[PDB]
Design a protein around this ligand. Structure first.
Ligand SMILES: [Cl-]
Length: 259
C-alpha cells in the first residue's frame, strides 16, 4: 500500500502538530496531519522538539530515539536565529568544525540521517517568516519579527543557508521563507495594544504595531482569536499556515516519487 515511514525533525512548528492544547486550541490540524491527508501512505513520526535550535537537535542527535525511516524532513532554524547562533558558511557543512554554526548543525543532522538509513530521502524546509511573537501561555516570553536583525543576522540568512545546503547535496528544499503566500503582513491581523496617548486599547495592524510598545504586565494578551491569520501568535502557524506548508511539502514528496 506504498507505506512509507516519515520522520519529521523540527522545532515547535513540528512539535505542535500533536499538542494542539499548547496552541490554546487555536489550531485544529498541524502540518504533519495535513500532509498525511494529502499523501495517506506517509506515516509521520513527530521529532519536533519544542523550543529547540538546530544546535540542540545536533547536540543531542544520538539521544533523540531517531529510528530508521524512508524519508526525513528537517525544519529548523527559526530558534537559531532568535538566539543569535552564527549561521556560518558552507565550509562548516563540508568539514567538521564542531556544532558551532547552523551549517555545522546541519552537517551533524544529515550525517546522522545517512547513518540511520543511507537510502532514505531527505527534504529540508526553510524557516517561515515570523512577525512579533507573544507566547500564548506566558506573554513575558516574546520576540520581535523577522523584519529586524537579531545579533546582526536576518532570518533570511538562515533560509539561504538551508537553500545552499540543499543545492550542495542535491537535496530538495521547501522554501517557506520565500513562499509568495507566507508574508509578514499576513502573519497576524493586528496586535491588541494600549494607545500610549490615552491608555485605551486599539487594534494596530502591521506595520503600525511595530511602533507601539507592548508591556506584558500592563496589556492583555495582544493576539485575541480575531488576530489569527497565517499564525496564531506571530510565529506558529494557524490552520491556514499549516495547510500552505503541508501543500508545499506534499509537492516535494511527489517529486521525490513518494506519492
Ligand atoms: Cl509520533
Amino acid at each position: 500500500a506504498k507505506e512509507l515511514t516519515w520522520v519529521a525533525i523540527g522545532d515547535s512548528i513540528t512539535y505542535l502538530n500533536d499538542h494542539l492544547d499548547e496552541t490554546g486550541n487555536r489550531v485544529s490540524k498541524g502540518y504533519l496531519t495535513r500532509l498525511n491527508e494529502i499523501l495517506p501512505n506517509l506515516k509521520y513520526i513527530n521529532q519536533g522538539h519544542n523550543g529547540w535550535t538546530s544546535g540542540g537537535i545536533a547536540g543531542n542527535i544520538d539521544s533523540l530515539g531517531l529510528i530508521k525511516a524512508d524519508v526525513y524532513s528537517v525544519f529548523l532554524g527559526t530558534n537559531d536565529w532568535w538566539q543569535g547562533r552564527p549561521v556560518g558558511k558552507l565550509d562548516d557543512y563540508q568539514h567538521d568544525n564542531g556544532n558551532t554554526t547552523v551549517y555545522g548543525s546541519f552537517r551533524i543532522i544529515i550525517s546522522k540521517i545517512r547513518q540511520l538509513n543511507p537510502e532514505a530521502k531527505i527534504v529540508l524546509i526553510t524557516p517561515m517568516q515570523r512577525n512579533d511573537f507573544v507566547y500564548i501561555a506566558d506573554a513575558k516570553n516574546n520576540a520581535f519579527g523577522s523584519y529586524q536583525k537579531k545579533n546582526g543576522q536576518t532570518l533570511e540568512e538562515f533560509a539561504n543557508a538551508v537553500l545552499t545546503i540543499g543545492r550542495y547535496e542535491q537535496i530538495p528544499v521547501v522554501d517557506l521563507y520565500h513562499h509568495p503566500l507566507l508574508t509578514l503582513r499576513n502573519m497576524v491581523k493586528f496586535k491588541h495594544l494600549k494607545n500610549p496617548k490615552n491608555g485605551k486599547y486599539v487594534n494596530y495592524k502591521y506595520p503600525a504595531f511595530v511602533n507601539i510598545p507592548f508591556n506584558p504586565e500592563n496589556n492583555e494578551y495582544p493576539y485575541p482569536p480575531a488576530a489569527v491569520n497565517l499564525t496564531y501568535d506571530g510565529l506558529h502557524p494557524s490552520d491556514k499556515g499549516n495547510a500552505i506548508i503541508a501543500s508545499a511539502l506534499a509537492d516535494v514528496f511527489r517529486q521525490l516519487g513518494l506519492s
